[PDB]
Amino acid sequence: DAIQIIDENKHFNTGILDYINKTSPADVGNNYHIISVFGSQSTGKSTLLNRLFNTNFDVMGIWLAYSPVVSTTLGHTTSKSNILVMDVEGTDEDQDFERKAALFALSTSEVLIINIWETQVGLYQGANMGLLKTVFEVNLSLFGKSKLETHNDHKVLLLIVIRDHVGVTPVESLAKTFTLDLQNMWSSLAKPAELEHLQFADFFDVTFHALNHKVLQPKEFGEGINRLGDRLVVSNELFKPEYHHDVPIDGWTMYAERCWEQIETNKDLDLPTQQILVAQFKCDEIVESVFQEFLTKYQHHFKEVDAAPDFEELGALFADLRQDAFEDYDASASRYNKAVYEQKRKKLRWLINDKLKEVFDVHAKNLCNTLLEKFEKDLVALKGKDFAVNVKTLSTKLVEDVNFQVSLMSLQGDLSLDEIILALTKDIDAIVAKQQVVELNSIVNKSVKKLSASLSKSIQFELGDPNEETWDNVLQQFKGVYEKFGGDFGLGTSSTQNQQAIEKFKFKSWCQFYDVTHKLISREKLLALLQDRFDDKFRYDENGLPKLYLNEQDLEKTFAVAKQHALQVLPILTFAKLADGSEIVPDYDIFDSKLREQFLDHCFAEIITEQEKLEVLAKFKKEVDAKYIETKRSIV
Ligand SMILES: Nc1nc2c(ncn2[C@@H]2O[C@H](COP(=O)(O)OP(=O)(O)O)[C@@H](O)[C@H]2O)c(=O)[nH]1
Ligand SMILES: [Mg+2]
């Protein structure tokens, strides 16, 4: 059963798309053929179509039908190209319709069948060289521009069926005559100057087929048909790929609709660009439908944010999803124009690659803040021990297995890492700058304490035998370990702030020097020291044996000797001075307001004040007097 694709009011049939869908399976693609038969009314057109292609047009607009089977001398044959057939009746008057219908047929058909009667071959009378000339014109206008400018090999086959052939004239003889009439008419056709050189054969192939008298030789007529079949489908002698219009079957209705609308409204129809447009439209909607198949298929994974992040197991789902999309797209779209098809595939690629990249970023720095957290941790756990290097080694393996782990889910480099490492880097550097200040300050603090611990034991030893050179001995030691700190830190320096860790480490030192001297030489200690010096000479022998006073010359004179021995030490301990007589001045004037806690008025060298010295002397005397009185009550 046949469908009218164009009725007499030049309207295009809406049902065509569904009609094509029924007769053509998803399989066809480019392997189909369009054949048109073109002629004035009742010249055997529907009859030839029904007998040859087995199609059901009515025998006494434009009608389309699928051919289930071709009539051949090998019987009913199904070619494996789908064959569609158009019955084009250009007259019923009108000359406008004729031109339009012929334009349609030539913009969609690979073969044009022209039925001409014999005794009337070579004459409008019962051929229409008027009809052929229209075909020549319509063909030139459709393909003359392409042919000149690209030299494309496109042709259409003219298949001339000679009807009611009797046989006194051989078909070979009729063919030669008619061929030369054809070329002649072509040469004389109005052409632009620059196509003047093109011939009939640059646009057309011809061949002939004689059919015997339908009414008077029915058996032979049947046979001649079957033989046309052999030519079409059994011997595949007629169809050629250079006749084929490059639009797969699924784009065909769109192509036919667009061609007809331009034709009907007298617009400039250009078939190359119209074929590109249908390809572009169709690949586009395959891109979109596939990309939507890829998406609810996506969501049902990726804001399911998930438990245990495996990077190779699903770094390859990325591949699967993207590969299955490629395959559903290749299936429908590869039939289309190569350039259009690949272009829109890339479009599909960089739509998939961008919603796959949002999972890329999430699972990525979830692993960065997972690894930065433990980075940060055993930095601290590496308790300041040689971070000279031990930053560089830790950053290295870190920055490295991020690369490894995350590469698993990039696609041979499609989703770039350049962004993510550039972040992981700055989050690593801005946290060595974190704890560099911690460990810089840390080595300051402990360097200060066993400075002060050494200072304290230096002073203590010196206290046993105070000389006018005991401050010398104290400052010597101090300034010694004072200059042994710096440039030796196992960190990233800052030539500047390596050395201003140093710079008042040098303070806290000066500060400590003051604090320790004043602790170790407080009134209370000084007094205790004085009593010890005193007893050493008043309570014991040189030997160290407890003393036994007999006389009071003995007591009184060693009493004087004991006191002086003790007090000879006061002028030295109450004020920090070297033998030269010079006051010890701290390098930094401490007790300064913001010179103090910029780094975290008294006298630094005054160990004991006047007022304190006077209290010490009063207390020294009272005690020393008592020891005296007693050891004299025990002499009697
Ligand atoms: N003598 C003769 N008559 C034919 C031939 N083919 C068809 N007819 C007759 O011509 C009439 C119209 O044919 P038809 O197929 O409807 O021509 P169409 O209108 O152009 O499709 C029918 O009655 C056919 O029987 C032929 O080859 N020879
Ligand atoms: Mg008809």
Side-chain angles (χ1 to χ4, degrees):
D1 188 4
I3 188 159
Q4 195 187 24
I5 176 159
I6 306 185
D7 65 46
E8 60 178 303
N9 311 312
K10 301 179 215 176
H11 172 75
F12 191 92
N13 187 321
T14 41
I16 295 306
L17 169 67
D18 227 12
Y19 178 92
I20 287 196
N21 282 345
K22 314 296 272 204
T23 81
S24 119
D27 226 29
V28 178
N30 300 314
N31 194 332
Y32 71 100
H33 293 291
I34 303 304
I35 322 186
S36 266
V37 75
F38 190 55
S40 56
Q41 211 187 0
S42 84
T43 53
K45 303 188 302 296
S46 305
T47 291
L48 179 65
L49 298 187
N50 296 326
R51 295 295 289 274
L52 174 58
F53 293 107
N54 299 287
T55 40
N56 190 22
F57 302 100
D58 311 331
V59 0
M60 250 325 291
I62 304 182
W63 297 75
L64 176 73
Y66 175 65
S67 171
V69 88
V70 185
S71 288
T72 77
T73 64
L74 301 194
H76 298 301
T77 301
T78 283
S79 76
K80 232 53 219 78
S81 288
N82 279 35
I83 296 174
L84 303 125
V85 161
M86 292 193 296
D87 186 357
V88 179
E89 232 147 45
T91 66
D92 77 337
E93 329 88 47
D94 192 332
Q95 40 285 315
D96 186 46
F97 193 85
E98 190 181 319
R99 201 192 97 263
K100 286 173 157 43
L103 278 156
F104 189 71
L106 280 176
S107 81
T108 51
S109 308
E110 321 182 24
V111 184
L112 194 61
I113 298 176
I114 296 128
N115 271 314
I116 62 143
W117 306 56
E118 202 196 342
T119 186
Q120 102 102 223
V121 355
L123 342 163
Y124 304 32
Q125 64 180 20
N128 257 51
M129 299 283 249
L131 203 78
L132 295 203
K133 167 155 146 152
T134 291
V135 163
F136 287 11
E137 288 165 354
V138 147
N139 180 260
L140 183 64
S141 82
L142 281 174
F143 299 100
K145 188 196 157 63
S146 301
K147 169 73 61 168
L148 183 59
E149 297 180 352
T150 78
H151 326 95
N152 68 36
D153 62 353
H154 180 86
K155 313 202 178 182
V156 66
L157 177 62
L158 303 179
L159 169 51
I160 316 308
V161 191
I162 298 135
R163 296 281 217 127
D164 294 354
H165 179 247
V166 165
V168 321
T169 316
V171 55
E172 301 73 17
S173 162
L174 299 169
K176 303 204 331 200
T177 301
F178 206 67
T179 295
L180 200 127
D181 275 279
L182 289 184
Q183 304 172 314
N184 285 340
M185 185 188 343
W186 174 269
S187 315
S188 84
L189 184 76
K191 300 168 251 293
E194 31 282 280
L195 301 75
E196 172 65 17
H197 71 277
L198 294 168
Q199 319 266 263
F200 173 74
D202 288 283
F203 296 86
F204 291 105
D205 281 332
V206 258
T207 190
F208 297 74
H209 198 78
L211 283 181
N212 299 135
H213 203 297
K214 190 191 171 293
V215 182
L216 299 179
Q217 315 194 261
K219 217 315 186 187
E220 283 96 337
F221 174 85
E223 279 159 18
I225 295 279
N226 281 343
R227 289 180 187 278
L228 183 40
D230 301 344
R231 296 183 86 189
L232 282 168
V233 158
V234 180
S235 322
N236 204 301
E237 178 213 329
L238 308 177
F239 291 134
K240 312 248 178 296
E242 64 255 41
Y243 307 153
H244 192 72
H245 303 285
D246 309 312
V247 181
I249 178 56
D250 320 277
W252 194 78
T253 83
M254 170 165 202
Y255 175 65
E257 295 183 299
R258 277 168 81 91
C259 282
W260 178 250
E261 292 183 304
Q262 321 238 88
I263 287 169
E264 212 277 307
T265 61
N266 292 324
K267 302 188 189 298
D268 178 351
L269 176 56
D270 186 75
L271 298 170
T273 67
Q274 203 58 248
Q275 284 161 16
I276 300 310
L277 291 171
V278 169
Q280 282 168 358
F281 178 96
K282 284 266 130 171
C283 290
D284 268 337
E285 84 184 13
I286 303 161
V287 166
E288 183 64 15
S289 72
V290 163
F291 178 70
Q292 290 274 339
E293 287 176 351
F294 155 66
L295 249 37
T296 46
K297 189 174 167 209
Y298 159 102
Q299 165 213 11
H300 153 89
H301 300 69
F302 309 114
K303 172 65 198 119
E304 158 245 45
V305 58
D306 91 329
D310 189 358
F311 279 60
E312 104 203 64
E313 147 168 290
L314 237 56
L317 178 65
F318 279 22
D320 269 11
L321 298 202
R322 181 165 147 283
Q323 178 42 49
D324 315 310
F326 283 145
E327 102 180 358
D328 271 9
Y329 171 86
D330 288 325
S332 323
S334 62
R335 301 147 173 182
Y336 288 88
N337 179 272
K338 191 178 93 168
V340 173
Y341 154 77
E342 294 179 310
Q343 157 156 338
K344 299 278 176 285
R345 203 184 188 255
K346 300 185 180 191
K347 168 170 169 171
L348 178 59
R349 198 199 280 278
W350 295 119
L351 297 167
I352 291 199
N353 278 2
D354 287 7
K355 281 246 158 331
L356 273 198
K357 185 158 184 46
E358 303 184 43
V359 196
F360 188 65
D361 295 341
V362 156
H363 266 54
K365 188 170 75 182
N366 263 47
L367 197 92
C368 286
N369 311 322
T370 290
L371 265 40
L372 283 163
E373 265 212 18
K374 195 20 180 66
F375 179 69
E376 188 179 78
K377 274 167 191 316
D378 47 10
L379 278 153
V380 186
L382 262 63
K383 297 176 293 294
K385 18 202 176 175
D386 311 349
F387 279 22
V389 150
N390 242 317
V391 43
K392 135 231 141 195
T393 171
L394 281 186
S395 312
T396 293
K397 157 51 155 159
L398 201 73
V399 72
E400 252 162 49
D401 61 22
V402 161
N403 275 344
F404 174 93
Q405 292 295 99
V406 179
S407 278
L408 300 162
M409 62 161 34
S410 62
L411 317 131
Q412 192 175 354
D414 267 38
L415 322 168
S416 145
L417 289 177
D418 285 16
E419 43 164 317
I420 270 307
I421 263 50
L422 189 76
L424 182 66
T425 277
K426 58 173 193 272
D427 295 16
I428 265 170
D429 285 26
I431 82 107
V432 293
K434 211 38 160 45
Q435 171 136 328
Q436 273 173 347
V437 316
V438 158
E439 307 297 56
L440 181 81
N441 190 255
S442 179
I443 305 164
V444 159
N445 287 16
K446 266 26 169 187
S447 169
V448 147
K449 299 194 235 256
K450 314 243 194 343
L451 178 288
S452 168
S454 92
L455 179 62
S456 180
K457 259 42 155 162
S458 163
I459 286 167
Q460 260 189 6
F461 168 84
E462 289 304 296
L463 282 181
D465 188 16
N467 167 328
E468 239 181 10
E469 273 181 355
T470 38
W471 284 121
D472 288 278
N473 299 341
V474 164
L475 183 63
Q476 186 167 316
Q477 163 307 27
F478 171 74
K479 271 262 199 205
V481 163
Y482 181 75
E483 105 169 305
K484 144 203 150 110
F485 137 118
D488 145 284
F489 319 154
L491 331 206
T493 77
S494 189
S495 163
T496 63
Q497 246 299 327
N498 272 350
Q499 292 212 318
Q500 313 338 309
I502 304 173
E503 253 247 6
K504 263 176 50 164
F505 149 88
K506 286 168 64 177
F507 198 68
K508 317 192 30 188
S509 284
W510 273 128
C511 273
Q512 281 288 290
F513 184 13
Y514 180 90
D515 283 6
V516 162
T517 49
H518 284 71
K519 170 192 176 61
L520 293 189
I521 321 185
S522 61
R523 278 169 294 142
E524 176 195 45
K525 287 297 175 213
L526 186 42
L527 282 175
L529 183 157
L530 290 177
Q531 282 318 310
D532 293 351
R533 294 185 53 89
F534 172 78
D535 292 331
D536 287 347
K537 231 122 185 151
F538 179 73
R539 190 163 181 253
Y540 304 99
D541 304 9
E542 181 135 34
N543 302 68
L545 277 153
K547 270 194 44 183
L548 210 174
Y549 293 96
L550 315 160
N551 194 287
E552 281 199 8
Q553 158 277 8
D554 292 346
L555 190 68
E556 286 290 5
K557 58 211 322 180
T558 46
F559 185 44
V561 168
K563 274 144 54 177
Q564 165 249 6
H565 182 248
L567 293 171
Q568 83 185 145
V569 125
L570 269 191
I572 292 148
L573 295 181
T574 66
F575 202 89
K577 261 159 31 183
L578 322 173
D580 76 330
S582 59
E583 174 163 341
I584 285 200
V585 182
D587 292 323
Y588 310 98
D589 174 346
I590 313 162
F591 323 116
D592 186 82
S593 57
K594 340 288 190 296
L595 272 187
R596 264 202 99 207
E597 194 172 59
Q598 148 184 355
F599 303 95
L600 188 65
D601 72 343
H602 285 209
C603 190
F604 165 93
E606 207 183 8
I607 278 90
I608 293 281
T609 72
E610 294 179 59
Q611 199 171 118
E612 290 183 295
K613 179 202 227 142
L614 287 196
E615 172 167 289
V616 165
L617 285 165
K619 284 174 89 128
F620 175 90
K621 179 173 168 62
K622 279 210 190 195
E623 180 158 6
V624 141
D625 286 348
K627 298 193 184 185
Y628 170 84
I629 283 151
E630 155 163 290
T631 68
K632 162 160 158 185
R633 291 183 181 174
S634 76
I635 228 179
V636 287

